[PDB]
């Protein structure tokens, strides 16, 4: 007897930069273009 909530949904359209998801490719693109925080030699 363990039920209640299953958190947010899941979709194939996932963001590369962060861990975001969308119900379409368009909504994903507009979000991928907004990603302009990463600049210079800084990543892992
Ligand atoms: Zn993102």
Swiss-Prot record:
Transmembrane segments: none
Positions in coiled-coil regions: none
Record's subcellular location: Nucleus
Domain of life the protein comes from: Eukaryota
ZnF region ranges: C2H2-type: 13-35
Biological role: Involved in histone 3'-end pre-mRNA processing by associating with U7 snRNP and interacting with SLBP/pre-mRNA complex. Increases histone 3'-end pre-mRNA processing but has no effect on U7 snRNP levels, when overexpressed. Required for cell cycle progression from G1 to S phases.
Summary of subunit composition and partner proteins: Interacts with the SLBP/pre-mRNA complex but not with SLBP alone. Interacts with LSM11 in a U7 snRNP-dependent manner.
Domain notes: The C2H2-type zinc finger 2 to 6 are necessary and sufficient for discrete Cajal bodies localization. The C2H2-type zinc finger 5 to 10 are necessary and sufficient for interaction with LSM11. The C2H2-type zinc finger 2 to 8 are necessary for interaction with the SLBP/RNA complex in the histone pre-mRNAs. The C2H2-type zinc finger 2 to 10 confer activity in histone pre-mRNA processing.
Family: Belongs to the krueppel C2H2-type zinc-finger protein family.
Protein name stated in the entry: Zinc finger protein 473
Source organism per UniProt: Homo sapiens
Residues of the full protein shown: 669 to 699 of 871
